[model samples]
Target: APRNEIEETLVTIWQDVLGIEKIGIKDNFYALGGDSIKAIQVAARLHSYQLKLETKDLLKYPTIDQLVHYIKDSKRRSEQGIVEGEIGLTPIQHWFFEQQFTNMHHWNQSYMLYRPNGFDKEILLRVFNKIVEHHDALRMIYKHHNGKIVQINRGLEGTLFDFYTFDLTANDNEQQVICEESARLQNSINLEVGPLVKIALFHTQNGDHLFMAIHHLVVDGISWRILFEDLATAYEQAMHQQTIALPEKTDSFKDWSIELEKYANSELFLEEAEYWHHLNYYTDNVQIKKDYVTMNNKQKNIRYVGMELTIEETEKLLKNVNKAYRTEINDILLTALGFALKEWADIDKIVINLEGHGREEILEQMNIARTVGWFTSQYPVVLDMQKSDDLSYQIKLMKENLRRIPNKGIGYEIFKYLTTEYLRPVLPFTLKPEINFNYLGQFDTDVKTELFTRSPYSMGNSLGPDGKNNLGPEGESYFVLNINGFIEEGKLHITFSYNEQQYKEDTIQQLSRSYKQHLLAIIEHCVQKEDTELTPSDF
Candidate 1:
C-alpha cells in the first residue's frame, strides 16, 4: 500500500515510464526489467511530478518501496532548465554531418508495412498527422546559419501530413513502381523545411502495403520503437474514433541536447573523460581491415543476405544461455559476433562501433520512455578477444567490458563535442568503423496482432531518383558493411546490408556463414551445460 501521495505517484510514474501493468510497490525496478536506459526514462518522467533523481539514485534505491521513501526525504528540484546553444551534434551525428554530400535530401530511414486485410485511408491520414504532432523530432529542420549549421525543432502547425496512394493490385510490376516512387519521395525531403516523415499507401490484390520514410537526422534505432508503438495506438484510436492515449510530453530533443551539453561540462563528465581519452588516443591510428575494398569504389548499392536460426532453436539458446551464463540473448549474440570477427577478419585487438539505445540513465526525473525521438549513443569498443578463445570466457569478458562504460559510452560524444577547441581539433576526421552491428530487441507478436495485421519495418538507406546511391559516387562508407540482428515475426532475423562495390558477394556470403556458425556453436555450448536458474554469480 502507498504510504503517502509521493508513494502513490511514484507507482503511477513507474507504470507510465515502464509501460508495464500491475507494478507492485516492492517490486524492484531492475527485477521488473528496468535497465540503464529505462532508468533514465524513469528519471525523465518524474519531471512533471516535481521530482528529480539521477541514474545513481535509482540504482541505489531500485525498488519502488525504496525509491518512494527516498523521494519523500530528498530535496526535489522545481525545474530542469536544459541549456540551449548553437546546434551541436552528438558523436554519431557529427559523423553524419561530415558525411553530408550531394543528394543530402535523400539521407533517410524507411520501413514497409503489409496489411493483408487492409486499412482505412482517411483514418490512416489522421494517424500519421497525429503521430507527427506527437514527436517533435520528426518536425525538426536544419539550416546553415551564421556561417555555421544549426538544427531547429519547428512547430508542426503549418506542416502537411502526406499520404500518397497507389494501387499495386493491377500488376506485380506496379509494386516495383510504387517502391521506386517511395524511394524517390523518401530522399526528396528538404532539410530546411522538413516535415521529414513521408508515407505512402499501396493497394494490392491480396492486401495493402504501407510505406514510411524519415530523415536519419531525427531518427535512430530506439526511435523506431516509439514510432511503431505509437503508430499502432494512434491507428487503433483513429479507427475507433477515440482520443489518442499517448502520455504527456517529457523532455524534447532540444532539451536533451541542452542537458547533454551541460553534462559535458560537469565534474561527472570530466570524471569519465579520461577513460575516453585513453580509449581513443591510439584508436585513430588503428585500422581494422575489411574483407574487400571498403574504400571509395561504387557509384551506388545495397545488397542484403538474411539467415536465421529457427525460432525454436533461438528460443532454446536464449533460455539455456541466459540461465547458464547469466547473459541475455543479445549478450550471446554479441559474444558470437566477437568470435566471428576474430576468425573472419583475422583480428582480435580490433575496435568496432557499438550502437546503444542511447536513452542513458543520466538525467533525473525526465521521462522519454514513450516519447518519440532519436536518442541513440554510438561509441567504439576494443572487442578484445586476444587471449583464450573459450566462448564462455569471452562472453564474460565482453559483458564486463560493456558494463564498465559510464553512461553507455557517451564520453566519446563529450570528447568530440564538449572539449577545448585545441584538443577537439586533434580529434580525427573520417573516424568511424568499416563495419557496424545492431541488435533490435524482441517484439511481441501477440501484441502486434492486437494492434494490426502486420508491423513490418526497416532502417532503410538512401538511394536517389536517378537510381544511384546518392550518398556518394564512391559507394563505400564509414560503416560500409552493417550486420543487424532483430527478433520479430516470432523469429530471429539477421540481415547483412553491405555495399556491393566495397566487398565481393562471395566474401559477404562467407562472413554470413561464419557469423551463423559462431552463433550456433555458442548455443551448443550452452545446451551442453547443466541447466540452472540464473543468479548473480553467473553474471
Candidate 2:
C-alpha cells in the first residue's frame, strides 16, 4: 500500500493528468474518462516520481488501492531508465484535428475471433502476459510538458491483469452483458483509459465461440498479425505446461523515433520539402465535399460507402487502357475520379489531395517500413478535366508525375515541413483540398473464412503494434475512399470504405457500376480504334 505522502502524490498526479478533482484511493481511472493518450500523460507524471509504468499496468491496476501497492513495490525495486520521447504526432493525428474525447474509444474497441479447441483460462492469461512483455507502447503512458506530449517509461508490477470469463448459459444475454461490462470497465478506472478498448469472451451453447474487442490506438494493421502469432505460441506453451520462448523484438518505438528525428534533418527531407513546396504553390486550398453528416455519436455508426472492383474488372481496365499507354491503375483511378467530380460538381479543374507513404529510400535506409513513425505524406495533384485527352494519354502523363515522386521521396519532406517548419496558418480541414484518394495495396495472402463467422464486434484482428486492430478513424472529406485487399471466403477480396455523408448508398453503387461501365467502354473504344494510334488530341 502507499504511504500517506505517496497516496497524496498519486492523487495529485491523477488530478493533474486527468484534469479532475477530488479523487480517492478507491476511485477508478475509467470513472474519470481516461484514454490511451491521457494514460500516457499519467505515465509522464509518474515518471516525475522516478516510477516506471505501462498503459497496461494502469488498465490492470486501475484503482488507487491497487496502483498504490504496485507503485510502492516498484519504487523498492528501483526500476528506472532514461525516458525517450515520441518522434512526432501519429499520421492519423496529422490528418485529423485532435478532439477531447475522453477515451481513444476506437483503440480499445476491437473484434477478435477465437476458434476454440477449448476454453483455457491459463491460456488466456499467458496470452495477456506475452502482450505485456513484447510491446513497450502498451506499457507506456504520456506526459505533457512545454505544450508537447512525451512518453513515460514504466514496468508492469503485480498481477496487473484484468480478466473476465463467461460460461455458455441459455440465458447468457452476452450482448447486453458485453455492453454493461464495457461500461463498468470504462467507469472503473480513476483515470480514463484514454479510449475505450473492449475485450470480452463468449461461450456458446455448443461451447464454441471466440471473440475479443480492442481499441485501435494500441495496434495497427500489421501489428495485429504479430499479436495473433504471439498469442497462439504462448497458448500452445501453456497447454503443454512448457515455457515459451519470447521472440526478439525487431526494434522499439524509441529507436524508430530516434531514426526519424535524424532523417527529418537529412538532405532527403530537404528534397521532399522542395517537391511539396512546388506542389502546394500550384494548388489552392479547397475543402473536400462530403455527401453526409455524422449524426450519431458512436464511431461505428459511421457508414462505409466506398466501392470495390473485382480482379478481372480491375485488370481489364488497367490492361486495355493503361497497358497500351504505359500507365498505371493509380493514374486511371485518379483520372476517372477527377472526371466524375467534374461532372458532379461542374468544375473544369480541381485540386485532389492524395495520400502517399512518406517513407523515402535514403542510402541504405529502408527503415520506413519497419519503423513506427508518422510516415504518411499528402500531395495535391492538379487535374484539368477540360484538358484534351486521349484519356489514356492523360493517364500516361499522370503516371509520369507519380513515378517522379518515389526517387526523391518528395512527399516525405513536404510533410516534415508542413508539420515542423512551414506550419500552415489555417486549420487543416480549412486548408484541405476539395478531392481526396487513398489506395492500400494488398497486405495478406488469400485465406478462406466465413464473413459472419465472427460476431459484429469492434476489434477485428490485432493489426498494428499494440495488439489491437482497426484503422484509427476516418477524416472529414466530401468524398473519401479507402482501397484494401484481404482474403475472405477462400478468395481475394477487395473492399472500399467511403464517406456516406457525401454519397448516398445508391449513388456510390452507381459510381461503382459506372466505373466498371466507363472503364469497359474506354477499353472497348481503345481496341476498336487501335488502328488510329491514339494521341492526346484523339479524345
Candidate 3:
C-alpha cells in the first residue's frame, strides 16, 4: 500500500502501466515488468495529473518510496497555440537522409486498434485536432534545402489529419480488405508535399477498427504509446462533454533538436568522440551462414520467425531473475543472444547494432517524456564472448562490457553525424554489424483501455514497395538478421526478421528456438542463485 496521495497516485499509474494487481511502495519497477516504454507511459499519465517525473528517474529511484522525493510539479510553460517553425534534424534523421533512400516518403510505422462499441466521429475529429495542435512534431514537414533535408513544423491550418471511412459490413473478407486498404494508406504518406500521417476507420460486423499510419521519421515505438494515451484521454474527455485539454505540453520536438545541435559541439560530447572512434571491433564485414549471397531489401523478401516463453517463465525472468547479477532485461537478454549468435555464426567475437531509447538526460531541465518524435539511437556494441563454459562468468563479462560503453552508445551517432567539424574527418570507419537488435519493452498493457484495445490485424509494411528494394535503390539492409524482443500477454516474445532470399526458413526457425532455449537457461541459472551481487550501475 502507498503512504499518501502522491504515492497512492503513483501506485495506481504503475499498476496500470505494468498491469500488476498489487504493487508496494518498495517494490522494484523492473521486477514488476516496467521497461523504458512503460516508464514513458507512466510519466505521461503522471503529467495528466499535473505531476512530473522523468523516465530516467525511474532508473535512479526504482521504487515508489524512493522515487516520490524526486517527483516535481508539472512546469510545462509552452504557449497555448500552434507551434510552427523550422526544426533542426536529429541524428537519426541525419542517418536516414545519409542512406539516400529513393522513396523517403513511405518509411512509416502504423497501428490498428478496435473498439466494440464504435467511436463517435466528431469526438475523434476533436481529439485529433487537439493532438496535432499540442504535439508539434505531428505537424512536421520536410523539404529539400540546398542539399540536406530541412524539417519545418506546419501551422494548425488547412487539412491537418487525413481521415477516410469505409463500410465493410457486407464484405465477407473484411479483414483482407482492411489489410489491403491499410497497406494503401501506409504507402500514401508523402514527406515533401505535406501530411505524414493518415487514418482510416472501417465499420465491420465485429466492431469499428481505427487505423493510423505515421512516418517513422516522426514516430517510434515510445511515440506510439504517447499518441495512444493522448487519444484515449482526449476521446474520454470529449465523450463527457468536457474541455478537451490533454496533458500539459512537454518541451516541443523542435526545442529538443536545437538543444541536441548545441550538445553535439559541447566539451563533454567532444571527449566521447575519441572513445567511439577507437572502439575495438573488426571493420571487415563479418560474414554469416546464409543460403545465398545475393540480397535485396524488398518487403516481400522479409520473413519472420517468432518464439515466446511461457507466462510462468516470463514472470520469473522479469521478477526476481535480476537478483542474480543485478542486471537489466537487456543485459540478460543480450547475453542470451550473444550465446545464440556465437553458436550460429561460429564467431567468438560478436558485434551487434544495438538500438536504444534516445530520450537520455543529456541536457539539464530538459524533459521530452511526453513529446512525440523519432528519438532512437543506433550504435554498435561488441560482445567479448571469449571461449567460456561458465555461464555465470559470461553474464558478468557481457554486463561489464555493456556498462563500460560511454553513455549507452548515444555518443556514437552524435560523433558520426553531428561532429562533422573535426571528429568526422578523423573518425575511424566502423563496420555495420550483420545483426540488428532492438528490445521493444512490454506492450500487453500500455495502449489498452476501456475504449479500445490493440487489434490483431496486420499493421502493413513500413517501407515503400515501389523502390528497387523496400528501403530504396541505394538503401539495403546492412544486417542479415534483425532481432526484436518484447513482452506481451505475460510472456516474452522475440521475433527474428531475416531476408528470405538470403536464408532458409528452417535456419531462422532453429536460430530463434535456440535463442529462446538460451534465454530460458539463463533464467534458470539466474533464479537459482543464493545471493545477489551489485554492478557498477547499481552504485
Indicate which candidate wins on lDDT. 3
Each prediction's TM-score versus the true structure: 0.80, 0.61, 0.92
Model 2, span 21-140: residue lDDT tens? 688888767545453334544554554464544544565677777876666323331112322345344444334325444343333323445443445766776777666655544444
Q: Which structure is stronger by lDDT: 1 or 3?
A: 3
Backbone collisions counted per model: 8, 66, 0
Cα displacement (Å) at residue 457, model 1? 11
- Candidate 3 C-alpha lDDT tens digits along 1-539: 22377898999999888878889999989877677677877877787777878777887688999998878887656444667889888889988877666566767777778898898887888888888888878888889889767899999765667888999989989878987787687677678766787888998888889988887888887888788878998999999998987777777888888888888888877866556544654554556778877845655567678889999999998887876887778889889988888777776776778888887767775677788899999888877777556988998877776776565777778777776566453554446677888887766565577789877554322222221112322345556788887766677878888888888999999888889888999999999985444424631
- Candidate 2 RMSD to the correct structure: 17.7
Q: In terms of lDDT, which candidate is stronger, 2 or 3? A: 3
lDDT measured at residue 16 in model 1 versus the true structure, 0 to 100: 60
Q: Which whole-number lDDT from 0 to 100 does residue 385 have in model 3?
A: 73
Ranking by TM-score: 3, 1, 2
In angstroms, give how far residue 14 of model 2 lies from its true place: 50
Error of 1 at 356 (Å): 1.0
